[model samples]
Target chain A: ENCIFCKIIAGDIPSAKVYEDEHVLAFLDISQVTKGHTLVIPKTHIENVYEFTDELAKQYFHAVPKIARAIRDEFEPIGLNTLNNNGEKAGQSVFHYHMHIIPRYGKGDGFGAVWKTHADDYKPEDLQNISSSIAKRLA
Target chain B: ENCIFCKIIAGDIPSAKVYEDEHVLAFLDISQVTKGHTLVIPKTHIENVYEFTDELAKQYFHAVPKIARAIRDEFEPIGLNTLNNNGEKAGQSVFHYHMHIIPRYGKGDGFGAVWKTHADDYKPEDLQNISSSIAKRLASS
Candidate 1:
């Protein structure tokens, strides 16, 4: 496959590997927004998080805490964030699925998320309507 | 318990519920960073992602894609982002563990992440060193 991460796992391309096992691999993200920023990924190619089934999700997420704790102990960051962008509009450059574990040093530490609150835009009735709409599609 | 999210889960506080099961609950984030922004949380109390055991994480995350897909279907955003902040330094206002499912409507979408690339600063040697340090802790454990 032409997937770059698949190549990293295949050994055709070198990576600064943090951890690897039969189902998962963790490595330093080439774009290290913070020190110890790593990407946790499934060994098998899945395009993105939207593609996960409940069973596959369980298997994929099983390794996250183990890997997260390792980064916690080693980096000693004040806080950390787990981020996954699903498509181009969401800032996903790679088509393959990967979770970016970015360690937060502080504001202006080279990584942050912009969340503009729109609490006033929706009333209780509007929220209920939106929630019901999403809920109906759950099946 | 003083946890606000626990109150929400218990129905002591009202929330616009999107999906719910025995172990998990998904509801619209009060802040609504985007039109369909939702917060997915575990029914049981856990402070943050750092506290997640492998089993707990597996159970907690199992509901994510289902909720994500539902949001996708209803809101129909061009993209989405899953974000979890672990501590105050990471912008976590609430103490309870929750994942934000923010739908993206392209530029000025009301939700975005800032990532300043440090790729130029870290040489392969530095990256390998950092990786090895983290790997050592994983191995020794």
Candidate 2:
């Protein structure tokens, strides 16, 4: 698919570049949510992590911290978050696989992720049942 | 050293186990952010992704989708989020390296992230300069 990120990789579109190697590319996000928000994407478009092979994951994951630490040093923020959304329903707007590294300044720092209690908690029996189902699939 | 996840890995502490291969393990997050909020972790005690060697990161991240799909089939989530926070400042409570694979339902689904526009924006020159500094570090390493 001819996506915006693929175009950026091919140099057909402009990006505020940071780091680029044979397999990965890091750049400042245009929609900067934090002080030093950045996106690190794979050069070969595989859409998402599920499609990522061992070799691809090797290169991709290695680049994450290298670029993330770069953001940490550049911004000197109190903390930072590394997040990747898979499907469109999970907030993945771009089809191309990318990781978001957002520098954090601490509590009430504009960026907040709320992981709330579920409406119905999983009881022991329900948890046991779900565990068995997943285990069977793994086997 | 004391590590809760290390105990969980050793089977000293019980976990709602899902997947356990030679290199990695998957279990339900004690704090279920979603219906099938699972935590995939490596068997070896690595602190975070930042410290992961190419060999380790390769094996760890490759295990991600395999378990995510298992959760998808069992729980039937509309979508999912794969997240990993590195430092304490980054919301990493556990010293062990773990990936949070969260199942999604829709709006008001008990999980939300507010990404607000920052107050101050950097100048173009500063961004370019910062970009070069990071680029150089990547080159050196």
Docking class of 1: high
Candidate 2 DockQ vs. native = 0.63
True contacts kept of each: 0.88, 0.72
The most accurate candidate by lDDT is: 1
Tens digits of lDDT, candidate 1, A1-139: 8899999999999999998877889999988999989999988898888888877787788677777889888878899899999988898998999999988887557789887988998899999999999999886
How do the residues B44-105 of candidate 1 rate in per-residue lDDT, one tens digit apiece?
A: 78897777877787778878988988888887889999998998989898899989999988
Off by over 4 Å in 1: none
Candidate 2 lDDT over residue span B35-121, tens digit each: 777889999998876677767767777778678778878878777787777667777888888888888888656666677765356
TM-score of chain B of 2: 0.88
Q: Alpha carbon lDDT of residue B64, candidate 2?
A: 80
**Displacement of the residue A67 alpha carbon in candidate 2, Å:** 1.6
Cα lDDT of model 2 by residue, A1-139, tens digit: 6799999999998777888988888888766777667899999997876677767777777778777767666667877777788778888889898888877877645566776875258776666677778778776
Which pairs of residues collide in model 1?
A: none
